[PDB]
């Protein structure tokens, strides 16, 4: 009734079996305690993933094929207070949910990055213009000459 | 197997290639500007000089693996039969005195113990083809009643050929301990004339299986089955296709499969849903025909290649097709997991990338069929339910491995190498789990030979170029598993061990010769040997030479790295996997 | 056939000629030639019979007889083997080799392939040889010693057909000794294209469809799509691809000629329609015939644009056939021109029959009578010029079947004096067709006699009507003649018998219909 989620750093995390079947990759691994490697995820990120699965033991999520029930689903209050973390560790939680095939954590953890791409100031969309190249310098000069009249 | 193809491609073509109005090998910096030593005059847009400390040949080498897998491990290892017709013997005085021994060698109670073994263990295989086997005990009784007769009808000889195909399936999947309790070996050695110390585990069970398959085909020839098309031909071939018969005789199995397509399409029943204006016998007949159809589509896709041009599978499981999603999920679950495999393995010889929407759809159907195989009944008083579970679970693990292999090759997405390693360990943990008693014969199904061939060939290929630790431990584990596969595969198992050994010696060659940088491409003897293996086996699969030999007395008239390539090809030849 | 009181209108005739377009298919294409009703519980099966039979029929033919057969094929049958094997002077060496290793015991697959090819050629020689040349070479007496039949019958009353069928069975048995399914090679396709110039596809129609399926499997195994010679190829390979081109066109011809419900895997559908250089002409005429006779089974009537385009192409290929030179000395060229002119007359007759049926165009019945007289004047000419083996080609059985069946069907309903004289000429010609067709000629005479006796029933019974449809017993008998043969071409009952314990269980109008069907049953054109 317990499985073990071995992290990439080597720590063993004994999780209850029904709670840990939120992961589609582990619930399919159980067709063979029962240990399993999670090779890229650190111990802290896997601990966050396991705590997320501990809260959503009884939760009800969309059917992973929904048009609007998946896109327009708001984040939980626990999911928003839960992901007030470092940015790279947020992306590593998203990578952990992508490896472990946890679609609702790859949903609620990934609407936060979507809320951070929008909702940002136009001043630092103007600043981050060609931090990745994406334009020739002739086209960059033509763009900066096109909207020079404003400022 | 060589281009530059570095990480962090540029968006626009560079300023130098627009100054010169040529094509742009759109890398950072370029393959076309690095060729001329203009490295520093192309980097200067932002950040600059970035660190390209990776191994750049790897993406266009994995795109080469997508072709090498198809031409070696699919076609050249299993589906290529090199035959010279001037040296091959041809007489029907041979099989009338050979197969007569194998038909007089099987006794009555031995055959009923074979049928009991099939009824108790192999229910996941014949029930697609023939249905329930308690109907077939009467046909074994009728075979032993009609054994001493002289005038046999065609209708009787079809049941004889069908039950001899069933006996072939029994002999192939029987463990050596249960086989020694039924059969004695010494009159068989007195007939064949070989070494006396050659017990069933040493390679005689495969000989008896191949000769029982040849006796089933001999009784089909006594039917004159081409003049009399009948569904029992299709059933007998679907029983024989559960063994290594389509890999022992890969050109005889294609002609028999073409005759099974001709026999099936002769009935002209495309919709297998029973209509409302049907005889209640006709309804059950169309249900049985619909089961035989999807079993035949599975065995029809599993023999696809250049030596099988007439296909049957004409329906798609994602997104002019005819015959899909009208049928109830009882044995199309074996086809729906192979039609999901055809969608992946159609891009092997094809020179285009699969779209990622297709791969995501295939991943969703993988999750659905995972839950559907978890939604099966568990008959603990039946041994064939666990074998059906193992078949439908090993197929979804195989298609999962191939899906994340194509994610690794074509797009290099999130942890897709770790997903390849994960599903390779799942395939191992499904085969090693059958090394316990009462299920040791589960590892004899030909899908495990195909799957272990693909997986150990990709891991041996990837160990050459990428030095890792998880991949190396996985390769050690698959080498142990390939050493521990059942010996009834025989020559194909020895050729797979030879191919793994050849890729390991090619790894040893990779760590010796220094890689020749050439700006836009690389050069190494390993690359040229891998290029040449495909050319050799495509030359062996070109029937123009047999055509020229057929049309009459026409006779066909046709640096430093070259020595290394020729010495490796003379030492480790790729033609040693054809026989 | 039709779409209470009585009437005498002509509403039934446009709905009845469209019914002829279905009846012609389901009787004269499928149920007369391509339907072999079989019973697997009654049919014997052993290799203790066909081995000794093939031993006798190969030990019967001697060395001096075989080269006389090959010389007959070289002198007289040049229009047939050239699409399959090309030159037969190359095959004298293989006949020499077959008589070299005849006494050996360890044969190869390649050698038995050449043996099967030359025994198919020997079957073609026996089938097309006149009785005056065939009685000189062979002797009738050991065949009645072996078969047990009475010695009073000569070659002319159905004995040459027995030797032809048994030599075809010897070619197939040597293919079985090749284990040809394990070794796909072009000698299978060539031997089958030689055997398909005889009545082998109509004596064993379900075996010939399986052999044709194996020939499609063998041909497409080579994966040669284009047959034009490339400049970079070996000049052996270019001649080889030209050889596969002239084999592919003959194979698509036989692929079309065996089209039916019992032949589901096709090759002629992969050749685009038109909508040496005398071998491509035969495929052009056969593809035009394929464009015509596709409208038999389907109900969608052709446009006038399609029939007019077929008419212009018909005039073009008529000029190409009339532009073929011929030598009265070279019998090969005479038989070549007979094949080309008979095929183009058959396509012309079918085109103007479709003009008469689908549109009732004026001066179309005169064209049908004219091209039927052209077909007669092609066949009756061969009896006067000592070339009576020209009338053994399998196209003159199919064409005369379609012609005498349509003229009988038209003489039932539409009275005319020219059609009646044409029907008398067709009846005399069907009586004068060669005896090498055997049972199919007797069944065509039976079908013509049945459609002649049905004219008497159309005469003696008055047509009725219900205001919208025209009831007549002749119409119901013609409905049931298609219903019975579509029941015979239904493989559901053979499927039920093959699955095992599943067993199948099943006014004066109706009296006249049942008495005619009890007197003239449509299941007597079957075997
Ligand atoms: Zn560039
Ligand atoms: Zn550049």
Curated annotation (Swiss-Prot), chain A:
A cellular component annotation (GO) from this entry: kinetochore
Pathway: Protein modification; protein ubiquitination
Pfam families: Skp1 (PF01466), Skp1_POZ (PF03931)
Subcellular location, principal: cytoplasm
Subcellular location: Cytoplasm; Nucleus; Chromosome, Centromere, Kinetochore
GO BP field: cellular response to methylmercury; exit from mitosis; G1/S transition of mitotic cell cycle; G2/M transition of mitotic cell cycle; kinetochore assembly; mitochondrial fusion; mitotic cell cycle; mitotic intra-S DNA damage checkpoint signaling
Renumbered residue ranges of the record's region Interaction with the F-box domain of F-box proteins: 94-151
InterPro entries reported in the protein's UniProt record: SKP1, SKP1-like, SKP1-like_dim_sf, SKP1/BTB/POZ_sf, Skp1_comp_dimer, Skp1_comp_POZ
Residue numbers carrying Phosphothreonine: 136
Keywords of this entry: Centromere, Chromosome, Cytoplasm, DNA-binding, Kinetochore, Nucleus, Phosphoprotein, Ubl conjugation pathway
GO molecular function: cullin family protein binding; DNA replication origin binding
Function as written in the Swiss-Prot or TrEMBL entry: Essential component of the E3 ubiquitin ligase complex SCF (SKP1-CUL1-F-box protein) ubiquitin ligase complex, which mediates the ubiquitination and subsequent proteasomal degradation of target proteins like phosphorylated SIC1. Participates in the attachment of chromosomes to the spindle. Acts as a regulatory component of the centromere DNA-binding protein complex CBF3, which is essential for chromosome segregation and movement of centromeres along microtubules. CBF3 is required for the recruitment of other kinetochore complexes to CEN DNA.
Family to which the UniProt record says this protein belongs: Belongs to the SKP1 family.
The name this protein goes by in its record: Suppressor of kinetochore protein 1
Provenance organism: Saccharomyces cerevisiae (strain ATCC 204508 / S288c)
Gene: SKP1
Curated annotation (Swiss-Prot), chain B:
GO biological process, one term: kinetochore assembly
GO cellular component: CBF3 complex; kinetochore
Something else known: Present with 1900 molecules/cell in log phase SD medium.
Keywords: Centromere, Chromosome, DNA-binding, Metal-binding, Nucleus, Phosphoprotein, Zinc
Subcellular location: Nucleus; Chromosome, Centromere
Name of the protein in its database record: Centromere DNA-binding protein complex CBF3 subunit B
Its job: Acts as a component of the centromere DNA-binding protein complex CBF3, which is essential for chromosome segregation and movement of centromeres along microtubules. CBF3 is required for the recruitment of other kinetochore complexes to CEN DNA. It plays a role in the attachment of chromosomes to the spindle and binds selectively to a highly conserved DNA sequence called CDEIII, found in centromers and in several promoters.
Residue ranges: DNA binding: 14-42
One MF term in the entry's GO annotations: DNA binding, bending
Quaternary state and interactors: Component of the CBF3 copmplex, which is formed of CBF3A/CBF2, CBF3B/CEP3, CBF3C/CTF13 and CBF3D.
Gene3D superfamilies the UniProt entry points to: Zn(2)-C6 fungal-type DNA-binding domain
InterPro entries for this protein: Cep3_C, Sec_Metabolite_Reg, Zn2-C6_fun-type_DNA-bd_sf, Zn2Cys6_DnaBD
SUPFAM superfamilies: Zn2/Cys6 DNA-binding domain (SSF57701)
From Swiss-Prot, chain C:
Keywords recorded for this protein, A-Z: Centromere, Chromosome, DNA-binding, Metal-binding, Nucleus, Phosphoprotein, Zinc
Quaternary assembly: Component of the CBF3 copmplex, which is formed of CBF3A/CBF2, CBF3B/CEP3, CBF3C/CTF13 and CBF3D.
Compartments reported by the entry: Nucleus; Chromosome, Centromere
Coiled-coil positions: none
Protein name: Centromere DNA-binding protein complex CBF3 subunit B
Known function: Acts as a component of the centromere DNA-binding protein complex CBF3, which is essential for chromosome segregation and movement of centromeres along microtubules. CBF3 is required for the recruitment of other kinetochore complexes to CEN DNA. It plays a role in the attachment of chromosomes to the spindle and binds selectively to a highly conserved DNA sequence called CDEIII, found in centromers and in several promoters.
Primary localization class, coarse: nucleus
Gene behind this protein: CEP3
GO biological process: kinetochore assembly; mitotic spindle assembly checkpoint signaling; septin ring assembly
Gene3D superfamilies: Zn(2)-C6 fungal-type DNA-binding domain (4.10.240.10)
PROSITE patterns linked to this entry: ZN2_CY6_FUNGAL_1, ZN2_CY6_FUNGAL_2
InterPro entries documented for this protein: Cep3_C, Sec_Metabolite_Reg, Zn2-C6_fun-type_DNA-bd_sf, Zn2Cys6_DnaBD
Intrachain disulfide bonds: none
GO CC entries: CBF3 complex; kinetochore
Gene Ontology terms, MF aspect: centromeric DNA binding; DNA binding, bending; DNA-binding transcription factor activity, RNA polymerase II-specific; identical protein binding; zinc ion binding
């Amino acid at each position: 009734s317990n499985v073990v989620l071995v992290s990439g750093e080597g720590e063993r995390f004994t999780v209850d079996k029904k709670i840990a079947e939120r992961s589609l990759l582990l619930k399919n691994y159980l067709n063979d305690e029962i240990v399993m490697p999670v090779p890229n995820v650190r111990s802290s990120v896997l601990q966050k993933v396991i705590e997320w699965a501990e809260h959503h033991r009884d939760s009800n999520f969309p059917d992973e094929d929904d048009d609007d029930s998946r896109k327009s689903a708001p984040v939980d209050s626990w999911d928003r207070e839960f992901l007030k973390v470092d940015q790279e560790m947020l992306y590593e939680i998203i990578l952990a949910a992508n490896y472990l095939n946890i679609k609702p954590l790859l949903d609620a953890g990934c609407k936060v990055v979507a809320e951070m791409i929008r909702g940002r100031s136009p001043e630092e969309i103007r600043r981050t213009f060609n931090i990745v190249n994406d334009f020739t310098p002739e086209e960059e000069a033509a763009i900066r000459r096109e909207n020079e009249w404003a400022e | 197997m060589f281009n530059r193809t570095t990480q962090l491609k540029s968006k626009h073509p560079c300023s130098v290639c627009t100054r010169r109005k040529v094509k742009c090998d759109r890398m950072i910096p370029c393959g076309n500007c690095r060729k001329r030593g203009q490295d520093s005059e192309c980097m200067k847009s932002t950040k600059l000089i970035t660190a390209s400390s990776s191994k750049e040949y790897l993406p266009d080498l994995l795109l080469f693996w997508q072709n090498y897998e198809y031409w070696i491990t699919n076609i050249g290892l299993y589906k290529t039969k090199q035959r010279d017709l001037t040296r091959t013997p041809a007489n029907l005085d041979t099989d009338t005195e050979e197969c007569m021994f194998w038909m007089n060698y099987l006794q009555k109670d031995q055959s009923f113990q074979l049928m009991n073994f099939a009824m108790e263990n192999l229910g996941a295989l014949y029930f697609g083809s023939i249905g329930d086997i308690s109907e077939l005990y009467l046909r074994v009784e009728q075979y032993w009643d009609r054994r001493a007769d002289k005038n046999h009808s065609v209708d009787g000889k079809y049941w004889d050929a069908l039950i001899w195909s069933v006996f072939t399936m029994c002999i192939y999947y029987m463990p050596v301990e249960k086989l020694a309790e039924i059969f004695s070996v010494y009159p068989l050695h007195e007939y064949l004339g070989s070494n006396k110390r050659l017990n069933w585990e040493d390679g005689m069970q495969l000989v008896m299986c191949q000769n029982f398959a040849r006796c089933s085909l001999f009784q089909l020839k006594q039917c004159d089955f081409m003049a009399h098309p009948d569904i029992r031909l299709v059933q007998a071939y679907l029983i024989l296709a559960t063994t290594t018969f389509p890999y022992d005789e890969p050109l005889l199995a294609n002609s028999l499969l073409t005759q099974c397509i001709h026999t099936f399409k002769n009935f002209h029943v495309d919709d297998f849903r029973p209509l409302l204006n049907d005889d209640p016998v006709e309804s059950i007949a169309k249900v049985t025909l619909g089961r035989i159809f999807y079993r035949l589509c599975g065995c029809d896709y599993l023999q696809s290649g250049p030596r099988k041009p007439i296909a049957l599978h004409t329906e798609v499981s994602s997104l002019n097709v005819d015959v899909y999603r009208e049928e109830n999920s009882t044995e199309v679950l074996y086809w729906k997991i192979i039609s999901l495999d055809r969608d992946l393995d159609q891009y092997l010889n094809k020179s285009s990338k699969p779209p990622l929407k297709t791969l995501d759809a295939i991943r969703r159907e993988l999750d659905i069929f995972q839950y559907k195989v978890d939604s099966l009944e568990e008959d603990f008083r039946s041994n064939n339910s666990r074998f059906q579970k193992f078949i439908a679970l090993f197929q979804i693990s195989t298609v999962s491995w191939k899906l994340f292999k194509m994610y690794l090759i074509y797009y290099d997405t999130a942890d897709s190498l770790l997903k390849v390693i994960h599903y390779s360990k799942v395939i191992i943990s499904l085969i090693v789990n059958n090394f316990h008693a009462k299920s040791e014969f589960f590892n004899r199904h030909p899908m495990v030979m195909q799957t272990i061939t693909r997986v150990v060939s990709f891991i041996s290929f990837y160990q050459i170029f990428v030095e890792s630790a998880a991949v190396k431990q996985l390769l050690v584990d698959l080498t142990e598993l390939t050493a521990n596969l059942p010996t009834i595969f025989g020559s194909k198992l020895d050729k797979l061990v030879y191919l793994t050994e050849r890729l390991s010696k090619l790894k040893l060659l990779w760590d010796k010769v220094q890689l020749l940088d050439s700006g836009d491409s690389f050069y190494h003897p390993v690359f040229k040997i891998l290029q040449n293996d495909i050319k050799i086996i495509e030359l062996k699969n070109d029937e123009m030479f047999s055509l020229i030999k057929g049309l009459g007395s026409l006779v066909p008239l046709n640096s430093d790295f070259r020595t290394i390539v020729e010495e490796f090809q003379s030492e480790y030849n790729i033609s040693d996997i054809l026989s």
